[PDB]
């Protein structure tokens with residue numbers, strides 16, 4: 001059809017990639033995936049509750065934290081209900097459903113409807129106690145009144161979905177390599193290495209002879225491997241590398257139809273910038289003009305009681321008790337395999353056990369599939385996200401192993417899917433095939449919930465915009481989502497994309513070059529910028545017109561744009577603007593990953609009734625070194641606070657921060673609340689930041705709200721474990737080497753928080769490992785990743801762990817202003 005063609009054009013603009021362009025493909029896997037994702041999409045669309053989909057209530061099944069219960073007076077929650085120019089306050093029980101609150105309202109005022117949060121597209125609806133609504137918890141946490149408007153539920157009609165319509169050994173011939181132009185810092189020798197890989201592990205390796213490195217190098221050589229065709233596992237990669245490591249490319253040996261790869265291939269390779277998720281890609285380099293190519297030929301197809309003694313059991317249990325980074329010896333693997341039926345009784349053993357499998361032996365793989373048919377213990381075990389994420393990393397390439405991990409994820413509630421969404425999207429990179437149980441899981445959860453769907457859009461779009469390695473795969477997943485989200489959502493994304501593309505242009509234009517910014521913005525406000533758009537990092541908020549007068553270019557070397565928008569919602573309780581920073585020059589994908597880990601740390605702390613006052617601000621990467629950042633209101637840099645008393649060239653003063661806090665507090669009651677908030681937030685950031693190895697920061701990269709909330713920024717790319725400078729210590733009523741009630745509180749909070757994180761050691765290790773592999777380029781799959789195991793002091797008891805962190809606090813006190821001064825000393829010399 002022609003409107004079908006028009007609809008595909010609309011999808012192309014939203015995706016930022018054309019899924020129908022078949023220039024960079026050697027098989028129909030992507031097209032097969034597009035067709036394959038139709039069924040799971042249609043099944044999810046057919047399954048959703050129209051009213052609940054339209055209203056997307058944001059709820060949790062978790063208990064109300066102890067720190068939140070203390071904020072409730074006499075089992076009473078006040079809700080302010082608006083109707084027009086008037087309002088009405090109503091007392092409610094924490095266990096009261098919005099349905100019962102609505103009936104309580106009509107009774108109180110006598111002589112169909114829905115409760116919507118004033119100024120937001122957020123609804124307090126469904127069979128849930130009000131204490132379980134995220135907005136209510138947000139209000140309770142932040143000391144804000146719950147303001148609601150009585151309005152008509154959104155028409156589910158707006159979400160209408162458009163109607164759709166061999167015992168021989170394996171061998172490979174390396175013909176040669178070709179590159180148009182040589183200048184590559186040298187003039188050398190080259191050889192080709194061919195690896196058969198499964199789960200990051202090399203099953204077999206062959207190499208060509210070394211030859212002089214010219215624009216064309218030929219071998220015409222058969223490289224015969226020790227592995228039999230019969231023994232090649234599904235998901236095995238033929239990894240081809242050029243050593244001078246300079247270039248790499250992968251080819252799936254068994255395709256998406258279970259057929260062995262045959263014939264001629266000319267593969268355009270990826271160059272090493274000068275392990276990680278990019279090294280695993282089955283995509284070929286789309287740049288056919290300047291990339292190195294490798295020419296190969298394949299010529300080769302259906303797919304083919306006892307009890308442990310005491311001491312061996314103790315040995316096995318000790319292997320299983322070790323962290324995810326502890327290497328498995330040949331003996332350890334053999335024990336795990338030999339007593340696999342005992343290992344299966346321990347869910348925590350699963351990653352180690354499946355790493356003990358000889359994936360290059362058909363009979364062994366067969367035995368593994370037999371083993372997993374008896375999955376009663378795994379199925380009945382409680383969901384452990386950390387343990388599940390370990391099965392979805394680079395170490396596992398078997399579909400059945402990965403699928404049992406995804407099976408476990410099905411039990412996650414929406415609030416929990418949101419917590420892990422970004423790293424689950426990134427984990428798609430470790431899938432051998434485009435169509436996977438993980439990709440289908442993301443698709444389903446996105447289509448089931450608007451909030452998840454909104455973030456799925458942006459997380460996928462971020463990678464499609466700048467990852468040549470994964471854009472094709474991520475584009476097919478995004479298209480599948482967009483074909484089921486409904487027309488209202490399609491319209492919404494269109495507006496957001498239009499706004500971001502225009503603002504990105506202004507960002508780069510101003511970067512090349514205040515008066516000029518304001519002229520460019522009036523021009524946008526004139527004939528381009530749509531009336532309103534959902535804020536990508538906070539979809540409940542709708543931004544209206546730019547407040548031109550409040551817009552500016554930040555006085556930084558990156559010169560980011562500081563933009564302010566009016567809120568488009570008339571029901572908003574304030575005339576306060578929505579602030580967004582647009583910046584080029586930092587890889588904001590790195591900030592996104594750190595910020596998500598901080599949200600996870602907060603949820604861990606919540607389990608132990610701790611509120612560390614982190615501020616994981618909104619951040620979305622929109623393209624190569626470009627994106628948006630949420631502006632936290634009434635916040636300043638620690639360095640700026642120092643500088644306002646006159647920055648003599650790093651002449652730091654101890655009392656300045658406390659002075660600033662006192663100056664910004666309207667009363668002494670508010671000032672004490674600010675000092676309390678600083679103690680908690682300082683503690684939160686010292687712990688979080690130390691664990692992640694990002695603690696040693698310049699003061700210009702730490703901010704504070706007038707309300708005392710400290711927060712670190714700019715995560716994208718002598719020594720100190722974290723920042724606890726003499727100014728921070730003075731706010732805590734401490735100086736030099738003495739102590740105080742606030743500093744004792746700080747130490748107590750840090751220890752409790754650090755110990756709480758250590759209870760989730762394995763989860764933090766997997767999340768850290770995945771973050772490095774997918775977000776921060778070439779990493780030593782050992783050394784770099786091992787930092788977090790050292791930071792989390794694995795193998796220490798709580799008292800030793802407590803002493804360790806208290807000693808880290810002392811290192812900071814010993815160094816004082818020395819490390820902060822070193823940036824200034826360096827920047828001059």
Ligand SMILES: Cc1cc(C)n2nc(N)cc2n1
Nearest residue numbers: 617629630631632635713714
């Ligand atoms: C990177 C960054 C993050 C936040 C939250 N803010 N807030 C302001 N006011 C500036 C800023 N920069």
